[PDB]
């Protein structure tokens, strides 16, 4: 096949990376593996290092004149590419071996293990009112050559490359998502019983969702309107828990449920970005440079609950609100995931 490449501005330093996207299987993530090309006499005294830094970057990098990133370093690791280190961990891999065969002796292997307790590539949508790019957790691989780790950064030395960490749907479907609500009155024995059920717990982007809602209005009040919407929750954790919730798609129908009556229906609602181009705070899946994408892919948590809260977490929920006459408004909420299938 092919291999992506990036070279230093000087042209003496070049790094070859096996893949641009990385995937996790909920127990082991595919290791980040690459090789670096360098001609020794250019440095002749220095050493070569590669860094995988994950940052809570804000704004952009195109020399924009504005308050730039709060550059919190979530997790940083180091590896001495040159001079050569012990063989681990553990071999040069098949791609590494093939690149060494292709190039020869001027390549140097480096290896990396992404801990399972790290976030997923997410990017907040930049608001039109502000300028430039917006904040969002992102990965980065930076290869630099220097005598010391703390030696000053040089543009000709350091080479910058961007990677993404995304998840793929498990093949095992989960339990049926459903809920119920029985709302009585303040004193009278009449009540209001409603039912909500879903087609599935997993969906693909653009694929419509048919919510199965049923109402048993064996009561005295009248239902004025039914509100159907899907809510997005973005758990942000830098050093304190935060939660910026925002709706993405809402559909309404002027249907009236009379007292002492039953009413059930199915509604079609689709989460899509075309109608929410301006809403600041919406979460989008990680971009490469600036290209568009879908909505933020729902991030499933591992079985062992631990914490995993070291970045941006996103989840989706659907709520149906029943507008009951002269008070007594009640709504039903329900969770579900929404993210890509397994490619080939």
């Amino acid at each position, epitope marked *: 096949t092919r291999v992506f490449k990036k070279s230093s501005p000087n042209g003496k330093l070049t790094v070859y990376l096996g893949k641009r996207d990385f995937v996790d299987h909920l127990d082991k993530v595919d290791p980040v593996d690459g090789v670096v090309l360098v001609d020794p006499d250019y440095l002749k005294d220095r050493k070569v290092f590669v860094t995988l830094t994950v940052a809570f970057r804000y704004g952009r990098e195109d020399c924009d004149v504005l308050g730039l990133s709060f550059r919190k370093d979530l997790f940083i690791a180091n590896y001495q590419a040159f001079p050569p280190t012990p063989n681990p961990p553990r071999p040069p891999t098949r791609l590494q071996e093939r690149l060494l065969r292709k190039l020869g002796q001027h390549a140097h292997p480096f290896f990396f293990t992404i801990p399972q307790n790290l976030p997923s590539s997410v990017t907040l949508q930049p608001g039109p009112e502000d300028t430039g790019k917006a904040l969002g957790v992102d990965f980065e691989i930076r290869a630099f050559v220097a005598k010391s780790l703390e030696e000053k950064s040089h543009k000709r030395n350091s080479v910058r490359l961007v990677i993404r960490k995304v998840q793929f749907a498990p093949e095992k479907p989960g339990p049926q998502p459903s809920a119920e609500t029985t709302r009585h009155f303040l004193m009278s024995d009449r009540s209001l019983h409603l039912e909500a059920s879903l087609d599935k717990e997993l969906y693909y982007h653009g694929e419509p969702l048919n919510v199965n809602v049923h109402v048993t209005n064996n009561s005295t009040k009248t239902v004025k309107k039914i509100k159907v919407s899907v809510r997005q929750y973005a758990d942000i954790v830098l050093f304190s828990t935060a939660q910026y919730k925002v709706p993405v798609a809402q559909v309404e129908q002027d249907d009236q449920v009379s007292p002492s009556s039953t009413f059930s229906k199915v509604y079609t609602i689709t989460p899509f970005l*075309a109608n929410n181009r301006e809403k600041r705070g919406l979460a989008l899946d990680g971009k490469l440079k600036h290209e568009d994408t*879908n909505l933020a892919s729902s991030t499933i948590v591992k079985e062992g609950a631990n914490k995993e809260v070291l970045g941006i977490l996103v989840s989706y929920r659907v709520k149906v609100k029943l507008v009951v006459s002269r008070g007594g408004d009640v709504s039903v909420e329900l969770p579900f995931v929404l993210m890509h299938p397994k490619p080939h």
Partner: antibody
Amino acid sequence: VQLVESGGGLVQPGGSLRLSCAASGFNVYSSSIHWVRQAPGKGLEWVASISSYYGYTYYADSVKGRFTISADTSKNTAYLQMNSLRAEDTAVYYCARSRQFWYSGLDYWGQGTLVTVSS
Amino acid sequence: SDIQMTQSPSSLSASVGDRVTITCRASQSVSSAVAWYQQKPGKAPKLLIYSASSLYSGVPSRFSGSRSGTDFTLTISSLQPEDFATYYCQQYKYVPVTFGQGTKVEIKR
């Protein structure tokens, strides 16, 4: 899953026409609609495309401005209106579908209809 | 800008069970967004190769594709007697997409 068209015929040059392709068995938002034309005995070439999920539109340079494209999510139907027709625009027209995530070719092709412009 | 293709040969003839190679060349570099399309005379076309190496579902394995820089190789192992038609080449990572000029394949006698 199927794909059907309707709206072919003969149009006076300097006139206008409107074509439709109804989609069934798949989802409009999780897909995209592209049209390509093929002159008789020539190689088929791309004309227009609409991306409902992104709310974006595109057109060929030779037919920029002259053509429009629209989509209706209620009936799972796409609509495009042809204006300022010229004698060279006559060809056979097709409606096509493609996976939105991601672009992987044009898996389904309609039965196709022809457009003739003459006096 | 306009990324024009240049295929060759425009036409060729073969027989049953022959090795047939048709080449697609691109005026610029395209990574993998190249597809192979076959169109029977008078009917709707249909995809054969997408992503420049994958064989689409519902297609006999006798078809195969290959890439070499800006040159693309499309081969058939044992040409079945109902495959005689035209073939089309396209690249689709730049807007707009561009198609080939048609390549006729027919039986020899």
